[PDB]
Ligand binder design. Structure first.
Ligand code: HEM
Length: 153
């Protein structure tokens, strides 16, 4: 469970994220695809974009990024009482897309990287540790929802 103070740090940095959701989306995905290439294969519509620049100019990918970070941002604002908008995420991702929890760790890594690269003065030790706790709570709860629908993490 997160402290009031940690939740505040998380939401403090997210507010910076929200000043350019689109750019953060692209960067996080680009990081993810380059760092763990097996991830790009889950996306049939992106798995041809060869270059970073091709990645950055794809408006399909751009929009996807915003859709992903908007869902995550609604969950973080719940400060962990996120049952209701966690469930549709787990049902899509467990039954349809079939995203292993390890791929969720991978994008968790990409998020923290990008966050630290774009906002170091607002993303120091305390803030990274808080965000990390936030994303680890999210992954635990989704792994439990995954199991409730079958197929284990
Ligand atoms: C922070 C963790 C994640 C967030 C919040 C997120 C969020 C979303 C949302 C909101 C959608 C659209 C509705 C639906 O879920 O189908 C989506 C679709 C999708 N997500 Fe995730 N996602 C996460 C990470 C992942 C990862 C790591 C991958 C693995 C490549 C993945 C693959 C997909 C795929 C394949 C779809 C369907 C895309 C399509 O064919 O249009 N997502 N995601």
């Amino acid at each position: 469970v997160l402290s009031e103070g940690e939740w505040q740090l998380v939401l403090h940095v997210w507010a910076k994220v929200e000043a350019d959701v689109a750019g953060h989306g692209q960067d996080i995905h680009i990081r993810l695809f380059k760092s763990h290439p097996e991830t790009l294969e889950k996306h049939d519509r992106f798995k041809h974009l060869k270059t970073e620049a091709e990645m950055k100019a794809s408006e399909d990918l751009k929009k996807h990024g915003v859709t992903v970070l908007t869902a995550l941002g609604a969950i973080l604002k719940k400060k962990g009482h996120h049952e209701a908008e966690l469930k549709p995420l787990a049902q899509s991702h467990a039954t349809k897309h079939k995203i292993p929890i390890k791929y969720l760790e991978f994008i968790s890594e990409a998020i923290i990287h990008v966050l630290h690269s774009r906002h170091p003065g607002d993303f120091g030790a305390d803030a990274q540790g808080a965000m990390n706790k936030a994303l680890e709570l999210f992954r635990k709860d989704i792994a439990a929802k995954y199991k409730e629908l079958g197929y284990q993490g």
